[PDB]
Enzyme design. Sequence first.
Site, PDB file in Angstrom:
ATOM      1  N   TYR A  31      -9.819  -0.973  11.011  1.00 24.62           N
ATOM      2  CA  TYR A  31     -10.137  -2.101  10.144  1.00 24.62           C
ATOM      3  C   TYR A  31     -10.959  -3.149  10.885  1.00 24.62           C
ATOM      4  O   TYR A  31     -11.806  -3.817  10.281  1.00 24.62           O
ATOM      5  CB  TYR A  31      -8.855  -2.722   9.599  1.00 24.62           C
ATOM      6  N   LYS A  63      -3.929   8.204   6.906  1.00 25.02           N
ATOM      7  CA  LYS A  63      -3.570   7.922   8.287  1.00 25.02           C
ATOM      8  C   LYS A  63      -2.516   8.856   8.842  1.00 25.02           C
ATOM      9  O   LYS A  63      -2.087   8.661   9.979  1.00 25.02           O
ATOM     10  CB  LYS A  63      -3.080   6.490   8.400  1.00 25.02           C
ATOM     11  N   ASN A 114       7.807  -6.811   7.193  1.00 24.96           N
ATOM     12  CA  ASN A 114       6.604  -6.090   7.574  1.00 24.96           C
ATOM     13  C   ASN A 114       5.424  -6.889   7.044  1.00 24.96           C
ATOM     14  O   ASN A 114       5.258  -7.009   5.828  1.00 24.96           O
ATOM     15  CB  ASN A 114       6.593  -4.660   7.024  1.00 24.96           C
ATOM     16  N   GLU A 115       4.619  -7.438   7.947  1.00 21.38           N
ATOM     17  CA  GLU A 115       3.349  -8.073   7.610  1.00 21.38           C
ATOM     18  C   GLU A 115       3.516  -9.152   6.530  1.00 21.38           C
ATOM     19  O   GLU A 115       2.862  -9.106   5.490  1.00 21.38           O
ATOM     20  CB  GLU A 115       2.310  -7.041   7.186  1.00 21.38           C
ATOM     21  N   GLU A 159       2.522   0.038  14.118  1.00 24.25           N
ATOM     22  CA  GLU A 159       1.467   0.657  13.320  1.00 24.25           C
ATOM     23  C   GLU A 159       0.161   0.645  14.090  1.00 24.25           C
ATOM     24  O   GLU A 159      -0.206  -0.365  14.692  1.00 24.25           O
ATOM     25  CB  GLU A 159       1.232  -0.029  11.963  1.00 24.25           C
ATOM     26  N   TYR A 172      -4.825  -2.515  14.186  1.00 28.74           N
ATOM     27  CA  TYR A 172      -5.806  -1.498  13.857  1.00 28.74           C
ATOM     28  C   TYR A 172      -7.157  -1.783  14.517  1.00 28.74           C
ATOM     29  O   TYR A 172      -8.202  -1.781  13.867  1.00 28.74           O
ATOM     30  CB  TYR A 172      -5.945  -1.425  12.359  1.00 28.74           C
ATOM     31  N   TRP A 208       1.074   5.317  13.027  1.00 29.53           N
ATOM     32  CA  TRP A 208       1.053   5.231  11.577  1.00 29.53           C
ATOM     33  C   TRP A 208       0.052   6.261  11.091  1.00 29.53           C
ATOM     34  O   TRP A 208      -1.128   6.164  11.443  1.00 29.53           O
ATOM     35  CB  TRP A 208       0.639   3.830  11.154  1.00 29.53           C
ATOM     36  N   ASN A 234       1.563  -4.517  14.368  1.00 30.51           N
ATOM     37  CA  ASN A 234       0.747  -3.581  13.613  1.00 30.51           C
ATOM     38  C   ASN A 234      -0.691  -3.990  13.874  1.00 30.51           C
ATOM     39  O   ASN A 234      -1.152  -5.041  13.406  1.00 30.51           O
ATOM     40  CB  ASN A 234       1.064  -3.626  12.119  1.00 30.51           C
ATOM     41  N   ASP A 283       0.841  -1.189   0.000  1.00 32.17           N
ATOM     42  CA  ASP A 283       0.000   0.000   0.000  1.00 32.17           C
ATOM     43  C   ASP A 283       0.882   1.247   0.000  1.00 32.17           C
ATOM     44  O   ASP A 283       0.992   1.953   1.009  1.00 32.17           O
ATOM     45  CB  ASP A 283      -0.927  -0.068   1.244  1.00 32.17           C
TER      46      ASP A 283
END
Lengths: 594, 600
Positions: free
Chosen positions: B478, B576, B417-418, B512, B474, B557, B472, B167
């Site tokens: 989300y 964000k 990352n992820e 994040e 949310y 983030w 991370n 992203d």
Amino acid sequence: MLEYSELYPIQNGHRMMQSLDGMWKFQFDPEEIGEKSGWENGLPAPVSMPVPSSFADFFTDHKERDYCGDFWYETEFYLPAEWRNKKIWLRFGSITHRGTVYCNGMEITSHEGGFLPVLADISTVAKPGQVNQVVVKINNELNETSLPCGATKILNNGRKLAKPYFDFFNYSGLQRSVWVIALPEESVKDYSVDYELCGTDALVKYEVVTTGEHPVIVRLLDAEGELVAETEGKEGILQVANAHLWEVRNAYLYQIVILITDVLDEYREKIGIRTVRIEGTQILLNDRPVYLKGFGKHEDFSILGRGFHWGIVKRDFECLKWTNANCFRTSHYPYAEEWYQFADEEGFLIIDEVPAVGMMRSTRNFVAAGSGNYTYFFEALTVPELLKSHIADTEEMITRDKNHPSVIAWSLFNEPETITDYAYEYFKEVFAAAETYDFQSRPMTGAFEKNSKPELCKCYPLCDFICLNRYYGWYISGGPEIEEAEELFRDEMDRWKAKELNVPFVFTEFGTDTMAGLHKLPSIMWSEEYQKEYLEMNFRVFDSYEFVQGELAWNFADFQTTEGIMRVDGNHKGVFTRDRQPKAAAVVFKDRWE
Amino acid sequence: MLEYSELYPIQNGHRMMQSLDGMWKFQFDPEEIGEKSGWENGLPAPVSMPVPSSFADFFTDHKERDYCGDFWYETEFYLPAEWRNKKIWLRFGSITHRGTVYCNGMEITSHEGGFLPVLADISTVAKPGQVNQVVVKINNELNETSLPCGATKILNNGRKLAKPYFDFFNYSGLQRSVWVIALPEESVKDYSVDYELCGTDALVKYEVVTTGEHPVIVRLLDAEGELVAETEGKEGILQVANAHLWEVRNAYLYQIVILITDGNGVLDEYREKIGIRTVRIEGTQILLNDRPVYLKGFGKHEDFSILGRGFHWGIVKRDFECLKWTNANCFRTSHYPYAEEWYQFADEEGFLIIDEVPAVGMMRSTRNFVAAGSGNYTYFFEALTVPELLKSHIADTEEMITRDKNHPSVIAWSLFNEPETITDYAYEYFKEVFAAAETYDFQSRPMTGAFEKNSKPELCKCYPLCDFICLNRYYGWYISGGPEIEEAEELFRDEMDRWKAKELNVPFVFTEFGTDTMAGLHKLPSIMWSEEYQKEYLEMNFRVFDSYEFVQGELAWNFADFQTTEGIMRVDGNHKGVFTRDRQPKAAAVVFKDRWEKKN
Ligand SMILES: [Cl-]
Ligand SMILES: [Cl-]
């Protein structure tokens, strides 16, 4: 004539150059104790400050953004040892607004004027092979003896606040690139070219200045490097047969090559063979008429202020081309030299403007440019010092920019007093001086506020063509009175027509503040729809007069101003936003200008 | 071991440099013909292109903005005569994403990886005292065999379109400064420093790599220029009496000076600034100079209007003044190594950095932010492309660590990352990356990465490899947002209670958390996307963080609104940011300032 060369730096055998751009040391000097305290030797407690850029918009507190007064930069560079026996200069593209340059502890030179290069001859203090230090004391205050004009308020704590007589933020610092350069002891100092067209053929008349007596050879190369003409002497004529002319939005660049011989120096620059003449009410470029279509602009972007970046140039030119413009005005000060270089490649026409803005004593100057109030500006005893500055800024500008094919006129004032013989006497001197510094005698002009009425104005007879700034439908009969405004506009253009001056008129300013995303049906001042309706009405008036030969809309992009109750985060008369995206009206220009 | 130096260029007598920044010549190559057609010798129909900058945002039409595939750069420079009898290199800060360098018609070298320096030895083909030519073929496609990962769609007219598995927008080109440089024939290639604290005193352990066999002496100078230590040898210990340590937001930098000596003469001289400080994880705590530190700051992006990822010092100056006003001490270089200048300046200002290799998008999804908590596994690490991806992942790690390891500001390496980690194919993949990274870093400093929600406590197989664990999450955006935010908090706490129960005794950082926030959008009561909702989401996440002894940092983030590829979930980039893309603050920026003024 000038104690230094205005020529852009190049790198060949004989000429060397090294960039000083990067992070410099920076420190404010509010008590003005730097000189007496050893700051010429190094700054006592500095911060980091990018160069090129403007210092103001990095900070997070008011006192520093709005700083007015003395302030210092310092950096350190290593000179190659191989630069012994060369003359060594520091070249600042600009020092805004004034400054004294110190190098390795010694004061080299000081300068006044914040938009033209500054040359410092450090030959006698430079230590080749070692590390060297440069230290610049700068001042960004405004007055009425230097350009651009204004004033300085002292607040209750004794801190200074800039109060300009112009409508743009007083950005300052080291805003353009900074080089250190090595020249030969005998060197090309200056040169000038003029063009004659002989049918399909062409003459490049030239003169050359050197720091010596050795013979000069001048060569002219075509785009692909092949030779097309050669002449000996510091004065000459180059014969180019079947010449390829620089055209509007279709450029061709030849390369001139100047040599000093026994080979002692070489200078190279791209030029464009074209001619500019005013016949009657027409602007002829290569003997055929051209209509100017484009924008007034500013050197202005987020964070960087007036700092030069090539990326701003690239995008700004891809937007001008998208609107189908062919022309812009370097309002209200000469730009960085890279803008003209790129205009040369792209075939844009430039009106080059000296920073003579503010010659009416008013801090809200844009409502006041049509109020009718004379400010007694050219009757004051500072005027002779001001005139000396203006002429020196005209001289440095023309010397710098005269060999660009894109530059086709000089603007020598924006919105001054013209309604009395005090101002005639002043401007007559300026034009007289500009006529002598331009080897091509291209048209000289200036932009007039509404207060310079046809019946009262004394200065338009000095102009080769006349530039008008007019806001009919914005500061005059705006909004629901917009039909009154059209009439009034026609009334005035009728009076100009009646004078039968037989010269061209160019509108150099018309526009409306427009907030992006403000829509209203029916439209209201400030919306995007009102901007379109405004422009469609000014266009009708322009198109009604045979002698209107140009429209330069104000502004290309939203830009930053002094904050105030009439300014909503700067000036929103842009056709683009400040991030370079188009409002609804940009499309209006695009369509009209195809 | 790498075939070149990552050492930043300097200018003394022994080492000279010249900048090639300016307008270069540029040309797209949609048919992929340049090499067979002689473009290596110059481009046939170029336009001008700023360097450094990303090309995408200059143009006014979609085809050029969205261009994917081969494209070419060209410029010409004069080499001073005096550089005969020097080794001459081109040094690009970055070639995005892969490229082949040509100098005066000759293929010099190729490079894969868009975010680290490219060194091209042009000593045999350079012409000093003459004008020289550089030409670069770049390709900005995405694949599953290099970083960062994506895919490449072919439209119906034959046009390539990038389809990243990440992203952020696929900016590319010559995004960083470019130099031509001269080195001595015997040069310092590399060095490394480690530190030990000795009360008032300090030791600087070091090691130097050169290209010949003449002897080395190493000097250390304090901030004022004075000599405080000296040692002969390519491996040594400098003994600093009454050391000034480098401290968070209170930096002190020594100059290290590395000489190669020919008896009474000098062959090469390299100087860098360094900072004495130590980093260690002890239990759940992150110890800097033997005291605990709480990380407060942001994930960032190299992103800015018009320039893209292009480097500018003013973007740095503004971005650091904002971080200081916020009271942060930290930021992560999400999701790729930054321009080196960023780190140089973090050293002066005393910020802590988590340095991230570009290992992002290791999970096949084109809308990958709705999918980091979806629960759907994509068998990413069982594909036969994986051995190639591993090799270039290690290669980027070695190059990042070799480049960045001597900045005091760098306290930890993030190596993913992820990605998908719920699988033994993934454990076997990352055991190798971490083993690699351990070897290239002389300070054996902490290694980590950042985990999506998908990598649950019960399922994950990769957190054992990490010296601390970055998350991370949310919750409240989300997951379970808006009206359901009460539930998002209990869900969050339920996950944290499970991490607790594992008693891992390691520190956890939140790397994040955030909400898309439209500047100026105000609602009472608040709604997802309003400024008010950003502040509340944050107050909620802070209550959660503060409930757990082992949480030792919070990187929100994002610092700033930034550009992504477009689509229905993206209103002109990612929103964000706590600051706008033009670096002014939304209402939740003071939430951070106040919390962080009063932490430690
Ligand atoms: Cl304040
Ligand atoms: Cl299009």
